Each structure stands twice: as C-alpha cells, then as structure tokens.
Scaffold this active site. Structure first.
Site, PDB file in Angstrom:
ATOM      1  N   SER A   1      57.111 -65.310  84.174  1.00 15.78           N
ATOM      2  CA  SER A   1      57.658 -66.627  84.506  1.00 15.78           C
ATOM      3  C   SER A   1      57.085 -67.098  85.848  1.00 15.78           C
ATOM      4  CB  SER A   1      59.188 -66.538  84.562  1.00 15.78           C
ATOM      5  OG  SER A   1      59.796 -67.774  84.240  1.00 15.78           O
TER       6      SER A   1
ATOM      7  N   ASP B   1      59.260 -69.135  73.432  1.00 12.89           N
ATOM      8  CA  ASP B   1      59.303 -69.011  74.887  1.00 12.89           C
ATOM      9  C   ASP B   1      59.671 -70.325  75.592  1.00 12.89           C
ATOM     10  OD1 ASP B   1      57.310 -66.823  76.959  1.00 12.89           O
ATOM     11  OD2 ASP B   1      58.779 -68.343  77.598  1.00 12.89           O
TER      12      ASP B   1
ATOM     13  N   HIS C   1      61.127 -65.740  76.085  1.00 17.69           N
ATOM     14  CA  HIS C   1      60.647 -65.552  77.446  1.00 17.69           C
ATOM     15  C   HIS C   1      60.601 -64.090  77.851  1.00 17.69           C
ATOM     16  CE1 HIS C   1      59.585 -67.204  81.322  1.00 17.69           C
ATOM     17  NE2 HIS C   1      60.505 -66.476  81.928  1.00 17.69           N
TER      18      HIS C   1
HETATM   19  N1  LIG Z   1      63.853 -69.668  86.189  1.00 19.34           N
HETATM   20  C1  LIG Z   1      63.354 -69.170  84.871  1.00 19.34           C
HETATM   21  C2  LIG Z   1      62.318 -70.150  84.263  1.00 19.34           C
HETATM   22  C3  LIG Z   1      61.432 -70.828  85.279  1.00 19.34           C
HETATM   23  C4  LIG Z   1      60.598 -70.086  86.114  1.00 19.34           C
HETATM   24  C5  LIG Z   1      59.808 -70.711  87.069  1.00 19.34           C
HETATM   25  C6  LIG Z   1      59.844 -72.087  87.193  1.00 19.34           C
HETATM   26  C7  LIG Z   1      60.668 -72.839  86.363  1.00 19.34           C
HETATM   27  C8  LIG Z   1      61.454 -72.208  85.411  1.00 19.34           C
HETATM   28  C9  LIG Z   1      62.766 -67.764  84.946  1.00 19.34           C
HETATM   29  O1  LIG Z   1      61.964 -67.502  85.868  1.00 19.34           O
HETATM   30  O2  LIG Z   1      63.128 -66.937  84.079  1.00 19.34           O
END
Ligand SMILES: N[C@@H](Cc1ccccc1)C(=O)O
Length: 290
Positions: free
Chosen positions: A102, A241, A268
């Site tokens: 992520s 995802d 994800h």
């Molecule tokens: N905060 C979530 C998705 C995300 C990551 C980075 C930026 C925006 C959204 C994660 O890292 O699991």
C-alpha cells in the site's frame, strides 16, 4: 524468535524487528502501509525465513512503537531517508531487497527512485505511484458498491460524519471487500489498524479512512519518475484490491523488466488471503535475483 530493538535512527528512535534466516540467502526490508499503520500486518512475510530470506520489519516515523518526529517531517521523502538510514545502520553497504505494501509500496518506489543502487530487487504489493490515480480508482469502487453502502459513504462522507454507524457499516463492508476478504481478520492486521488509529501520522498524512485520502499526500504522484527504476521489480495486486490492478499497471508500464502478478480472489492484504501463494511468489522472485 526475531531480534527486536529500539535504536536511534536518522535522529529519532525507531522500532525494528530483524528475523534472520537459518541459512540466509538474501536480506528483505519491508515497509508497512498506511501512512500510520505498523509492521505488525506484514509479519506473515516471516515465513520467508524458511526460504533462506532474512526479513527486516520496522515501524516508520510516528507508527506503532517508534517515536513521532516533528510534523514537518511527516513526508514520504522523510520516510525514504529513514529507511536508508535504517538499512545502513543495520546492514551497512549490503544490497538488500525492498518490499512495500500500500502506502509502503509508494514509499518503496520513492526510495527505489533515489536509492536503487542499494537494492537488488523491488517488490511492490498493492502500491501506488500516484495517489490521485488511487483516489480516482477507489471512487469507482465505491460506486460499484451496492447503493445501500455507496449512498452512505457519499452522504456522511461529505458531512465528515465518519462517526455515524450507517457510514461505519459501509466502511466495514467496503473493507471486507477490498481490504481483506475474510470473516476473521488476523490479530496482526487489527493491531496495525488499531495503531494507525491511535497515532497521528495516519490522520495527518492519509486521512479519515482507507478511501478518504485527504491528508498531506492527496496529491503525491511520482509516475513520471519511477521509469528510472532499472532493478528487478515484482509488482503484485489483488483482483478486488482497493488499490486496483489498474493502478498497479501504471507502475508496471514504467518500470522496465518489471513483473505484474494479479492475485485472483484476493484484495489488498493478499499476504493474508493467500499467505502461501503470496509468500512463494515473493521468495521465488528474490532467489531468482540473488
Ligand atoms: N490506508 C490504506 C490504503 C491507502 C494507502 C495509502 C494511501 C491511500 C490509501 C492502507 O495503507 O492499507
């Protein structure tokens, strides 16, 4: 067990956990997502030590157990130097493998763009080279969501009423659809989510939730730069995802020689939905590029 420590890194005290492989063949450095999560939800990658791959976990600035630095340092560029400082403070001049999930993947790219000379390979799982792109894609996901939850996310979302239970149910559904497709979320995952909700980084750099990226990185985008990455790159993404495979495609399309693997029936946190398949993929990649 792994060797943990609370040493000073790049100015502030960071928490890191090194799990050495019995017959080490490569060092893998990991970067958790968020911003604001923790290494906790990446521990599943520990299995790789059984494949001769040492894995280094660590909480980034203001995350998990590590201390929070001056808010002016709540940047991706800062995390990069932090990572480099940690990579040299622990391994010195040894070229390692960098993995990012992520936000950690985006960070991994940023690092790779500047310090790829210190890397033997780059792994980006559900990462992004552009936040707006990621946002443009998540909005689509919300629209594809059954109206019931879509209208809720859109209704209470514009009124910043994230505390509302109706908005919650939607955020819960969406998560169980694009974050982790499973009934029983593992502790490690809940711990990282809990951490991000107790520290400040998440609130300041990311925003309210997974798809409400209104923080200081809402406009981050280094797509027109990642092309500079020449090292072996493995880009993974889940079918459902939250950071859609189309967002992964953009990274793949630039980094020459890079591989793009889409984990079917995964979202994800593919390292938990397909812990065996996910780990095998990463370990096989690393060993093929020693
Ligand atoms: N905060 C979530 C998705 C995300 C990551 C980075 C930026 C925006 C959204 C994660 O890292 O699991």
């Amino acid at each position: 067990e792994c060797i943990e420590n609370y040493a000073k890194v790049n100015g502030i005290y960071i928490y890191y956990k090194l799990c050495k492989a019995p017959e080490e063949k490569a060092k893998l450095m990991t970067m958790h997502g968020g911003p604001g999560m923790s290494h906790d939800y990446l521990l599943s990658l520990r299995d790789m030590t059984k494949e001769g791959i040492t894995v280094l976990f660590y909480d980034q600035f203001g995350c998990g157990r590590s201390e929070e630095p001056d808010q002016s340092k709540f940047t991706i560029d800062y995390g990069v130097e932090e990572a480099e400082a940690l990579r040299s403070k622990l391994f010195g001049n040894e070229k390692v493998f960098l993995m990012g999930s992520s936000y950690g993947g985006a960070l991994a790219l940023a690092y790779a763009v500047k310090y790829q000379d210190h890397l033997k390979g780059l792994i980006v799982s559900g990462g992004l080279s552009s936040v707006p792109l990621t946002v443009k894609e998540m909005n689509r996901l919300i629209d594809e969501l059954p109206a019931k939850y879509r209208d809720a996310i859109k209704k209470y979302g514009s009124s910043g009423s994230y505390e509302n239970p109706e908005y919650q149910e939607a955020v819960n559904y969406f998560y169980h659809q694009h974050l982790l497709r499973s009934e029983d979320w593992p502790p490690e995952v809940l711990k990282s989510l809990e951490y991000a909700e107790r520290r400040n980084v998440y609130r300041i750099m990311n925003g309210p939730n997974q798809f409400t990226i209104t923080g200081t990185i809402k406009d981050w985008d280094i797509t027109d730069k990642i092309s500079a990455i020449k090292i072996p790159t493995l880009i993974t993404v889940g079918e459902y995802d939250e950071v859609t495979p189309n967002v992964a495609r953009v990274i793949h399309e630039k980094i020459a020689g890079s591989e793009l693997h889409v984990f079917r029936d995964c979202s994800h946190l593919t390292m938990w939905e397909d812990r065996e398949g996910y780990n095998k993929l990463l370990s096989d990649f690393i060993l093929k590029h020693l």
